[PDB]
Design a protein around this ligand. Structure first.
Ligand code: MOO
Ligand SMILES: [Mn+2]
Length: 130
């Protein structure tokens, strides 16, 4: 899709507080079409339902972690191009490499500011012509 008010986001994290941060930041930026999932399976269930244009996802989560989530999305014919922004406390260079090589559209380290999220989302929008 396009980075207009209608773009539908999926915000994935096993902790409510973290999802709430992202949802509120997106609202501020003018994106109100936003759904949440608590783990990778929950996320795929919603994604396969259709209509999503952007995923923002944690890494460490039960049932299916965010790296598996990202890999699954990238390998799936119907959603292989979906933007996926990783947002995680994992800061080791080897975590960043693993996610980058798996196809992350971007990578933000927790804790993060409103400015940081905005600029990294905008970097992805520009890269993809949205
Ligand atoms: O649950 Mo995370 O990937 O450690 O912020
Ligand atoms: Mn987590």
């Amino acid at each position: 899709h396009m980075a207009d008010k209608e773009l539908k986001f999926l915000v994935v994290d096993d902790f409510s507080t973290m999802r709430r941060i992202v949802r509120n930041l997106l609202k501020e930026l003018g994106f109100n079409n936003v759904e949440e999932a608590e783990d990778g399976v929950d996320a795929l269930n919603k994604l396969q339902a259709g209509g999503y244009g952007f995923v923002i996802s944690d890494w460490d989560m039960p049932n299916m972690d965010g790296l598996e989530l990202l890999k699954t999305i990238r390998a799936d014919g119907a959603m292989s191009a979906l933007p996926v922004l990783m947002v995680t406390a994992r800061a080791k260079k080897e975590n960043i490499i693993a996610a980058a090589q798996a196809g992350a559209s971007g990578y933000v380290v927790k804790p993060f500011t409103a400015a940081t999220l905005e600029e990294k989302l905008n970097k992805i929008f520009e890269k993809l012509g949205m």
